[PDB]
């Protein structure tokens, strides 16, 4: 919303104005990947001990 | 009310007078700041309830 002044004389009368605006959000995405070492998976999961 | 200073010799002699000045007042007027719309005027009173 806006404030007004009270102009005098040879001019149009200032009238109150209000301004509504609509602005839209944005979607993005990030990523990372730790590929785990093959035999070490078997070494941690059991059945190589 | 003005002062003066005594003055010697060949100068002419001065004498006190006074000043009473008058001035008018200017007229300034201003106007601003209101408006409404029909859909409210129906709704703020009587009709659209």
From Swiss-Prot, chains A, B:
TM spans (from-to): none
Superkingdom of origin: Viruses
Localisation per UniProt entry: Virion; Host nucleus
Family affiliation: Belongs to the herpesviridae major capsid protein family.
Primary role: Self-assembles to form an icosahedral capsid with a T=16 symmetry, about 200 nm in diameter, and consisting of 150 hexons and 12 pentons (total of 162 capsomers). Hexons form the edges and faces of the capsid and are each composed of six MCP molecules. In contrast, one penton is found at each of the 12 vertices. Eleven of the pentons are MCP pentamers, while the last vertex is occupied by the portal complex.
Subunit description: Homomultimer. Makes the hexons and eleven out of twelve pentons. Interacts with triplex proteins 1/TRX1 and 2/TRX2; adjacent capsomers are linked together in groups of three by triplexes, heterotrimeric complexes composed of one molecule of TRX1 and two molecules of TRX2. Interacts with scaffold protein; this interaction allows efficient MCP transport to the host nucleus. Interacts with capsid vertex component 2/CVC2. Interacts with the small capsomere-interacting protein/SCP.
Protein name, per record: Major capsid protein
Organism encoding this protein: Human herpesvirus 2 (strain HG52) (HHV-2)
Portion of the parent chain present: 100 to 148 of 1374
